[model samples]
Target: KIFAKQDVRKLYLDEQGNVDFNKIQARWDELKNIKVSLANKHYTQAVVEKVKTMSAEDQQRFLDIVIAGLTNDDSQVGISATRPEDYDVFLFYLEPIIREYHKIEGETKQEHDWNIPVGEYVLTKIDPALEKVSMRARVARNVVGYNLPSSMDKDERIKFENQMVTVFENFGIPGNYYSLTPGHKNFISDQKADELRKRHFLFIDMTSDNHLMSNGVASDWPFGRGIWISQDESKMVWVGEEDQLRIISIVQGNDLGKVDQSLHELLNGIEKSGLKFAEHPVYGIITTCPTNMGTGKRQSILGKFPNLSKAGTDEANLKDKAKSIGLQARGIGGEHSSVDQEGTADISPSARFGVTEAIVTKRLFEGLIVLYQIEKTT
Candidate 1:
C-alpha cells in the first residue's frame, strides 16, 4: 500500500466516544489560535527555542502548513492547482510560515550579494510540489500528537500511520527528486554532471492562458508557467550544435505599433527576435484593481535592498533620492497606477520588498526594450 491506512484516522480531532465531530472541530480552531500565538511569540524570542520545544511531529506539521500557504499565495510559482479535497482544519497551519517567507529576509552572505542558499532556493522554487504530497502525513501525525492528552489508542496510531504511508508514496518528482544508494554515490557525482546535462532538454513554456486568469494570471506561484523535460533526440532539429547549445541566434526590429499595444504584443516581438520574456505574466494584463485597471503595464528594478528599514518611504521621495531605477513599478501587488489607465510613468522605488518575486514576463516590455544574447547551457 502506498500509504498506511491507519494514519488517516488521526486526522480526526475527536476520537473519544463522547465528543461530536463538529464541536471538536470548532474547539480545535479556538485551540489553534492559542497555539499559533504561542508558537510565533516563542519563536521570536529565539529562533531555536520554539523549534526545539516542538515535537518532531509538530515541527513537520508546521512545515506542511508553511509550504501550503506559500504555494497558494504564489500560484505562478507553479506547484499545483489548489484543491478543496486537501482541506483539513490543521491544513491552515501551513499558511503562516509561507506568509512569513513572503515578509521576512533570511540570513545569507553579504559578500555573495545576499543570494539565497541553493538548498533553500531549490526548496523555495519547488515547495508547492512538496506541500501537496507531504500534507497527509503531516496532518495525520500532528492531529494525533495534538490529541495525545485525551487518548493514545493502538488503533488510532495504526490509522495515523496508514495516512502517512499514503502520503509518502506520492512524495516526489521521479527523475528530479532521486534516491542514492550507498554504492551509487557516483550517480550524480561531479564527474557525471556534464554528461547528464547533455542527456535531456529543458523546455519552459511561457504561453499565456486567457481562460485561467481574469487580470491575466497571478505571477506569484502555480499560475505562472510550465517547465518540463525531454530526453535527448536528434530528430528534434538542433539549431546550434555547439557546446554552448546555440540552436539558433538572431535579432529583428519592429515599430512599437501606431499606439501603445498590449504587453502581449511586446512579448510576441521578443519571441520573434529570439529572446525569452523574463518578467511576470500577470503584470501586463488589465484588471479592476483600484490601481492599474486600465493600462496594467508595470515597471520596476531588480536589485537588492540597500537598507531594509527604509521600506515605507514615499515613492516620489524615493525616485528623487536616486538610489536605483527599476524596469517599471506597475502590477497587482506593487505601486500600480490608476485602475483604468494603461500607461504609467511613475519611476520610484519604495519598500516594495516582496514585489520582485511577484513580477511577470509582460512587465519586462514596459520601457525601451533592449535585447542581449548570452551563451546557452546544455
Candidate 2:
C-alpha cells in the first residue's frame, strides 16, 4: 500500500486511560505549575491566562510544543512546530513568539522568490592565503503531505522516506539510502552512520535531545529515519530529521558556485519530479523552527582564518567582523564553540529571513572574501 490509515492522538500528557478525557482537571492541575520553557521565554501572561481557561482539546492544540519546550532548555530557537498548521492554530501565542524571535513586527508582509538566478551564480574567489577551504550549501525542506518529525508516526515516517527514496532514484540522483530504522531492509549499522556524521554527511540523532524529544520529534523510537548519501558523498538528503529533507551539497574550496549548483539540481529536481514541499507565501520555506522560516537556507564554509584568530580576537571580533560584512562567523563546533586547533571557523550570512537564497549565497561568499582581505591586516 502506498499510504496507510492515519490516527490522531493526544499531543501532550499521555493519559494512562484511567481518567475521563473530559474531566482531565485533576491531571491538568498536577502539571499546571510547569512554568519556564526551554527558550527562556514562557507563554505571555495574557495567553497563559487565556489558555488556562481554554478547553483540554484546545489547550493541547495550542501548547503541545510549548509544553514540550519546557522539557528541556536547549538549542537556538527552542520549541518545535509539530505540524505546519501549529503556527496557524496557535497564532496568538506563536505569532508573538515568532515575531519576537525573528524580530518581525506584526505588520510584516513577506514572500519567497525561488525564481532568482542560481545556476549562473558565480562565487568570488577566496585568497590563496585561505587554504584547504570547503563550502557546503544546506537548505531545509519539508514535504507537503508529510508531518514534521514532531508529529509524524512511525508508519508515516517510513512512508515519507519511501516516497523520498523514489524521488532521489528517479531523478537520476544516484545515492544509497541508509535507514536507521532497525530491521528495515536498507538499515545501516551504527558504525556506518557514525562515519557519515564525522564527514558531516549525516545528521545527529535527536532522541537524546530533551527539547526535541518532548516536542514529539522523538515521539517513538527513531523508525524510518536515515539519510540518502550521493554516490560521491558530496550531496546528501537527510530524511525524517528536523525537516523532511535537508538537501545539502558539498564541494572542496570556498566557491559556493558549484555548491549552489549541485544543490539546486536536487532541490528543483525534487520539486519538479512530482514532489511538493511545505512552504508559504509569507513564511517562505516551512521549517520546524520559526527562525528558519525564510529560505531555510544556510550557506557556510570551513576555512582557515589563522591570522584572524591568532590573537584573542576570535570572540566578539569574529562575530562583529562577520556582522559588518553581512555574515556570521562561528567556531567549527558551531555557536559558542571555540575555534578548532587548525584555526577553522564556519562563516555564513546571518540573516535567515527576508532574503533570497541567491542573495544570501552572494552575500555569504562575497562577505567571506572581504573577511579574508581583512585577515591580511590581522
Candidate 3:
C-alpha cells in the first residue's frame, strides 16, 4: 500500500534536470477542478493560491509529494515534507495541518516533554486464550547535523551509516552493522539480506513506498540504508531509512517494565556514547514527517483479539474501540495490513505532539490493560 512505485522525481524535473514548471502547471491544472478537491486535504484557497505562483525553485523542493498527494487523493493531511526547512518553508500551509492531524489546540508552540516515565507497569491480568503477545517501543531519530533522509547527499548518507556502526560497536549494543550499499566494506550478502527482509527485521527499502519515493526519500536507493539487529533480533537501529535512525526494542509480552527497560537501555547507550539526536526547541524531535515531530515515538503491542475482531463491520469496530481510547489498533503487519488468521493487530498510541513521553507511557500501559480485559469479555 506504501508503494510510491517509481523514480517519481521525473514527474517534476526536466530532461537536463532543471525543475520543470510546465509539468507542475499541467498537474496543478488537472487537479484544480476535481470534484473532491484534494484528498482529505484541508488546504485553504489561500495556500492553493500561493502554490500557484511559487517560483520553480520553491516548487522544486517539495512539489513532487504535493502532486502525488493530489493524484492519489490519499494523504489525509494533504502534503509531505522532504527536508528540515520544508516545515518552516511551508509554515503557513503546515502548522494548521499538523495541529489538525495530531489534535493539538490553542496557541502554544509544539512542545514535548522528553522525560520517559521509567518503571514497571504490571498488567493485573491477561486473557488465557491469548498467547505470546508482544509489545514494541520505537522512536524515529535523526542526527543533529545531517539533512533529513530524502535531502541528504550520498556522502552524507554514507557518513551517517558508518558513524553509527562505531556507536553500536563502542557502546557494546550487541549488533553488527549491515550495509545495503554494495561496495561498502560492511555490506551484507543478498542471501542474508533476504532473510532479514523476510523476518521483517529490516529497515524499509523506500523505493517501494510511494509516499517516500515521491518525496525524494528513496533517492539513493539501497545506499546508506541498513539495520543493526541484535543477536536475538529484538533490538534494532535502522539507519538512513524513514528517518536517520529508528531505534526499537520488541519483546514477547506486554510487560511495560521489560519493554521500557530495553528501550531506554539502547537510547541512553546512544546518548552517553556522545551522539545527540536532531531536536527542536518547540518540537522534541526534528523528524522529516511533521506528524512525528514531537517525541517521534510509538509504543505498540501485537496481540490477538479474536473475540473483538470479526469480519464485516466487526473488525473496524475494534479499531474504533482503540481510537476512542487514544490508541490505534492497526493490523499486525502495520497500517493497511489485513488482520492475520489469528486476528492479531498492533495497538499503539496515536498522539505524538504536545504530550510528554511519560504521559504517553502511562496511557499505553493503562489503556492496554483495560483493552485486553475487554477482549476477554468481547
Candidate 4:
C-alpha cells in the first residue's frame, strides 16, 4: 500500500485534491526535451546508442549533469565522469563529444611506460632553446580499496590523508620536505600560499561547479587537505584535492628532462613502497574526473609568444590552432585569464583519455615548436 499511496500522491493528489494530467505531462515533456537537446547538441551515433540503452530516469540524470557542465565556462564541452563505472558511459556519451569539440582523433589507449628508466624517455631531448618560462607535469592516482574523495565522509578523508602522510614520510626523499596542512593554523601562512600561487604550485579553494563540488570531490572544505613540497620546490604532492594523490614536478626553465626525471623518480619511489593505485582495463588510472582517465597525466609549458600575440593572434584563434593539433592553450594564470603584456600562455594536451603519456608530451612539444616558429616569423 506504500507504493499505492506514492502513485496516488503523484497521479491523483494535489493542493486542491484534484487530478491534473496537464502538470504531469508538462513535467514529462521537460524530461523529453532534455533528451532531445542532448542528442541534438552532441549528435553522434555512439551517443544515440548509449542514450537508447539508458532508462528514462537515467537519461534525465545524465542531462542534468550535462547541462550543469555546459554552464561552467572553464569546462565547456564534457561532464566529469566521477566513478570507476562512469568509464563505459563516458566513452560512449562524453568522450565522442569532447573529441569532436577539440578535433582530436584515434581511439584512447592506456600507457604504462613508467618502468622505463628516466634516461631513455624521449621528452628528455626537449630543446633548451625553446622560449619557455616554466614546465610542469602531474598525474593523479587514488589509493586501492578506498572511496574517492567526493564520496568519502570526513573521517574517511582524514584517514586517507593520514595514510598518504605516512607513505611520504617513509619515501626517504632527498633534501628537506615540508607538508602544509590547510586545516591547521600557521601551517600554511597567507604569505606562503601567495608565493606558491605565483609559482603555480598551489590549488585555490574549491569553487562550486559540476566538475568538483557538484560531483562530490570537494567535500568538507579543507578539512583533510594538504600539500608537500621539496625544499627546492621542484617536486610536490597534493593530498585530498580532486584526486587522492596529485604528484607533480616542475622546473624553472625549459629543462623538460629534469622535470620528467623528477616526476618519474617520485612516482617510482611511491609505487615501490607497495601502495597499489586504482586502475581499470578500459579507463586506465581511474580518477575522480573523467577527463583524466587514460594516462592520468598532464604536461604543460608556460611560454612567451609576444610575436604571435602582437601580430593580432587573438585568444580564440590561438585556441583554434591548438585544438586542430590536439593541444589546449590557456592564458598564463589558466582558463579565462587574459594573456599578459609579455604574451605568456599555458599550452598542454587537450585529450588524455585515448593516448599514452609519451604521445601526449610529444604532441605538446611538437605543437610548441610550431607555435614558436610562427612567433619568430611574425
Candidate 5:
C-alpha cells in the first residue's frame, strides 16, 4: 500500500471521517513521501492505478497532497499544471480522487449533446402565474496566447486585462457600456462595487482562501479585476474571475432564445476581433475550474414554486431530485444561498464539462417546464 492504513487513519482522519489537518502537519515526514513518489517518473502509472482502487479515506488523503502540490504558494513546491494536454499529470495525480468524491465512473467521457434548437415558445412566452424572474446564460473563455489567471504573475495579468479592454472597446456593442476597475479613479465615486454586487455582477474576493491564494489567482488583489456592462445591464463581461473572460447574456423573463442568441452573436464578434479561446478535444473548452471544463457554459432560470415549497420540499431534497434528472437548483442569490420566502429559486443543468451548450440550455428549459407542471399539481 502507498500509505499504511493505520498510519493514514492516525495522521489524516478523525474518529468521524473529517480531515485532521493538525495530525497531518505532525506527520508531514510520512506524507511527504507521496509527493516524492509523484515526482518520480516510473511511479506515475502505478500511482494512477493505485489511486483508482483506493478506499474513500485513502483517496481523500491522496488528494490532500495532490491539491496542495498543485496550488501551493511556494513556486518550488507548487507544480504548474493546466490544459487537457496535461491530462496525464492530473490522471496520475487527481482524477481518480475526484471520481471518488463525485461518485463517477473512470471511463465516463464528459458529455456534449447540444442538438436541440431554441423554440418559439421559450423566446416569446412568460408564465405570469409562476412569477418568472430572470434568465441568464454565460460562458467562460481564456485568451489564446496568454496563461490562465491561476498561473499569471501581476505583469502578465495586467497585460491580459489591457488586451481584453481593447477587445471590448472595439467590439461595436450597440448600447452604452461602462467599464469599472477597482482602484481606478471613478470606481468608488461611481459606486461601481456596490452597484455590481446588487446586480450580482461582482465576484466575491477569494484571496482569503488558501487554495486560491496559493494558485496566484487571488494574488495581487483588485489589480486586473473589472467588469463591462451594457447600459441596460443585460449583457456583461467579467474580467479576472475564475476565467480570463466570462461573457454573459441575461433577460428579465423566460426568453431563453433571446439570451442564447445574444450570447452567440457576442462570441462570434469576439472571435472576429482576432482573439482565440483555449479549447481541447476531450474538454471542448478549457476553464480554471474542472467542473466548467466542457462547453464552459452555465444556463439558469429564476422562478417561483410555491406549492412545492409548501409541500415541504427542502433544498437538499430538491437538489437530489434535480441531480437525478440532470439538473441543479440554487437559491435566488445563486449557489449556497437560500430560496426566497415566496419559493423563488434558480434552476439549471448540473454538468457543464461533458455536454454541449445547446443541450445544457435545452435540458434546463425542459426541466423547468417539468417542475412547473409538478408545482401546479402540488
Candidate 6:
C-alpha cells in the first residue's frame, strides 16, 4: 500500500495512496520559478546566502526530499536518491541542464570504452634506436608430426619462419631478423657473422609440432632439446632440455575500428590456416579506463616534478616536494580483457579463476565480462 505523512500526502500523494501526479506537476512548476528567481539575484551570492540560512542537517534533509521528488513513481525513487555524497545532490539537480559546466569543473564518469589512450611512462635508458634494429631469432615451439630425420622436411619449418618475419615487418622491423637454420648460416661471412651470432640467441630443439595437432597426430608432444649460453661466451650451454619458441602478435592504437580490424585480420589468418596458435606471444592491447573514458587523460603529480640533475636542486628539497604532491599517472585497458582461449591472461580449466560455461552468446558475453575484470587493473 502507498504511504506518506499527512502533510506530504496532502501535497504530493492522492487518495489512492500513490503519488499525486497533478500535485507533483504543480509543485515542480513552483520549484522552477523559485530557481529562476534565485538565479537572477546573483546566482553564486544566493547560494552563499542559502548556506548561511540552513543548518547542515536541514540542508541534507532538504536535498534528500528534492532527490526523492525527482521520481514520479516510488519504484524508481530509491535509485535516484543514492547520492555519492551530500555535495553530489547539487550536481544531480544541475547536471542534466548544465553538463558543459559539470564537465569543465572535473566531473568524472565511470563507464569506459575499449580504445581510449590511458597511462603512459617513458623509459629513457633503453635506446630507441634498438627498437628499430633487426636481430635474427627463432621462436620454436613443440608440436606434433615431428619424428627424427625422416619427418624434418614435412615440418613446415620455413612457413613458420616466414610468419615470424611478417610479424616483425608489421612492426617496422627490418626484414633481416629471420632466416632458415641452414640457409641463415650461409649468408653470414665466417668471422663477421660469428660476431653477430655471438650476440644472438638460438632455439635448437623444440617439441614436435604434431603434438599440437588436433587430429590425433601427436596429441601429447613434449618440449624439444636446446643449448643456450650467455652472451659473454665464457661457459658451456645446456642442450639437454627441450626448447620451445613462440611468436606473439603485438598491437597498439587509439582507434577501436583499427584495433578490431587488426584483430580480425590476425584471427582470420589463423582460422584459414587451420592451426591453433600458441597463446603466450600476443600481448593484450591496453587502453584507458574509468577516469579517462573517452580522452584517456590521467593526471599524476610525479610527471611535473623536475629532474634531480637540474642544477641548484638539493636531494632534500626534491624528497620534500615529492612528499607534498601525489603523483599523477594514466593507465590504459580501463576494463577490457583479452580473449580467454587466445589472449595473454590464460586461466585454463584447472586454475582458480577458471569457470566453465555452455557455448551461447549470452554465456560468452558474461564469461568475457568476468575475465576482463579479472585481468584488468588500474
Winning candidate number (TM-score): 3
Q: Give the alpha carbon lDDT tens digit for every residue of 212-272 in model 5.
A: 6544456566677777776677888888876888999888754576678777877776788
Q: Which structure is stronger by lDDT: 2 or 5?
A: 2
Lowest lDDT block of 10, candidate 2: 1-10
Poorest 10 consecutive residues of model 4 by lDDT? Answer: 1-10
Stretches of candidate 2 off by over 4 Å are 1-42, 45-56, 74-77, 114-126, 129-132, 311-316, 333-341
Q: How do the candidates rank by lDDT, highest first?
A: 3, 2, 4, 5, 6, 1
Which candidate's lDDT is highest?
3
| Tens digits of lDDT, candidate 2, 256-364 | 6678778888787788787777776665677877777777888888765667666433556667777888877775643355445455677887763476666777777
- The C-alpha TM-scores of every prediction are 0.21, 0.81, 0.82, 0.70, 0.71, 0.21
User: Model 1 misses residue 48 by how many Å?
Assistant: 14
Q: Model 1 scores what on Cα lDDT?
A: 0.24
Using TM-score, rank the candidates from best to worst. Answer: 3, 2, 5, 4, 1, 6
Q: For model 3, how does the per-residue alpha-carbon lDDT over 1-378 read when each residue is reduced to its tens digit?
A: 543424555676788876665675565556556533332245455765776577776766656446446445445444656566667777777766677766766654545544554335645345544345576888888776677886777788888888888898888777777889879887989898888887788865677766676566776778888888887777888888878889999987645667767877888888987777877565457787766787777888876776777632356877987787778887554335654555677888766456766677778877777777777777
lDDT to native, each model: 0.24, 0.67, 0.70, 0.61, 0.60, 0.27
Stretches > 4 Å off in candidate 1 = 1-60, 63-94, 100-190, 194-359, 367-378
Per-residue CA lDDT of candidate 1, range 211-285, in tens? 122121222211111111112121111110100011211111121111122223222332353322211122221
Clashing pairs in 2: none
Question: Which ranges of candidate 5 are over 4 A from the true structure?
Answer: 1-85, 88-118, 121-132, 175-190, 311-313, 333-339, 351-353
Model 6: CA > 4 A from native: 1-155, 162-173, 178-180, 183-186, 189-193, 201-245, 248-378
User: All candidates: CA RMSD in angstroms?
Assistant: 21.1, 5.9, 4.2, 7.7, 9.4, 26.2
Writing each residue's lDDT as its tens digit, candidate 4 over 1-378 gives 111111222342256644433443344345454443332355445654665477754554454334333323344443544344554555666555545543445655465664323333233344445534587899998877676665666788778777777777788775333335555432677687778767767777764433565545666766677777777778898888888889998877655555667788788878987988888774478776555566778888877656655523466666666677777877553346543666667888665455666666666667766666566676
Q: After superposing candidate 3, which stretches have Cα over 4 Å from the reference?
A: 1-26, 32-59, 62-67, 70-72, 109-119, 124-132, 310-314, 333-341
